[PDB]
């Protein structure tokens, strides 16, 4: 199964991207399967865990977001899923979450993954993006590097591909 999870941070704009496919074995099921759930998160690995963690996280997160209208800090969200998945260290759910998105009101990006850029998934990516990363890109550039890394790593990869979604988070605009 799986799926790839591109994620990249150049300038305040926070890139993240993913393949839109999942397979029952080696046969593609759908050419449209959401992995990037809106400070965004992109989970890949099993589909069951992708959906399970997305549901469980939005639940725990909404209890907080009602309890304070204060938007969540990216670091605290990282702790939220970190603790949420470590509870099964005896029965661990297989999905690799990579959050990407702004620190509130300071317009400061925070990307991270959980067991520059953080790639995760079934993939091809970590060796591809690393010397191409520019520490400064306008979104116009940021889209281009992440789209290249996405398309090149994933077209090669057998079990990913067939549709790409790219969110380049900014307060001003969020392109897709």
């Amino acid at each position: 199964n799986g799926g790839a999870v591109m994620a990249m941070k150049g300038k305040n704009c926070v890139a993240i991207a993913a393949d839109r496919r999942f397979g029952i074995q080696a046969q593609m099921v759908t050419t449209d399967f959401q992995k990037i759930f809106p400070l965004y998160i992109g989970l890949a690995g099993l589909a069951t865990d992708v959906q399970t963690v997305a549901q469980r996280l939005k639940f725990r997160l909404n209890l907080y977001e009602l309890k304070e209208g204060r938007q969540i800090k990216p670091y605290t969200l990282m702790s939220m899923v970190a603790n949420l998945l470590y509870e099964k260290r005896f029965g661990p759910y297989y999905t690799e979450p990579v959050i990407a998105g702004l620190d509130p009101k300071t317009f400061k990006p925070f990307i991270c993954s959980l067991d520059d850029f953080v790639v995760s998934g079934t993939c091809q990516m970590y060796g591809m993006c690393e010397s191409l990363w520019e520490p400064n890109m306008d979104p116009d550039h940021l889209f281009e590097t992440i789209s290249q890394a996405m398309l090149n790593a994933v077209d090669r990869d057998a079990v990913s591909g067939m549709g790409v979604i790219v969110h380049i988070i900014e307060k001003d605009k969020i392109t897709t």
Binding site: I24, Q27, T30, D32, A47, T52
Partner: protein
Amino acid sequence: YLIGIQGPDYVLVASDRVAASNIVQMKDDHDKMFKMSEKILLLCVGEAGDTVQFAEYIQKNVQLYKMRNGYELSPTAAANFTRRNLADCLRSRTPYHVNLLLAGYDEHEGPALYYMDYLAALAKAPFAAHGYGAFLTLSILDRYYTPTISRERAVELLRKCLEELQKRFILNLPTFSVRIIDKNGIHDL
């Protein structure tokens, strides 16, 4: 084997009427229809009691809701409900092995069918199939199907898929319980 098609103002679903333990089929009337509401319709391929021990367990909730709330659930809503159950059973002592299609027709959200993996991997399906005859059929339906279609044409599109299960496939699945779901609600064909 199960097959599902999404149309302009309908959802089309159809099922082989068979089950077999051993070398023989022991019935050919076996209903892999699991209709649960006026427009929420599971179709469950899978071995043993688990397909129906699950199907009914969902049905009675989906129905229990309708009495208790006075209104009927969305195809999506029912879908995410059954999805939740299957995810729980995967980690459980009893992981059910049911591969099911939740057909349904919301009025204001429109017709929808969902593929659901036994593990529990819900996904909206433009068209879908299940079983092991799924490896054969999905290509025919993927080539042939377009955005437009008609319920009149849906019958031909489905009749062509029936040929694969006899003509190229080893197992004989001889009668197909075609059914539709349309604003009117479910009908047998």
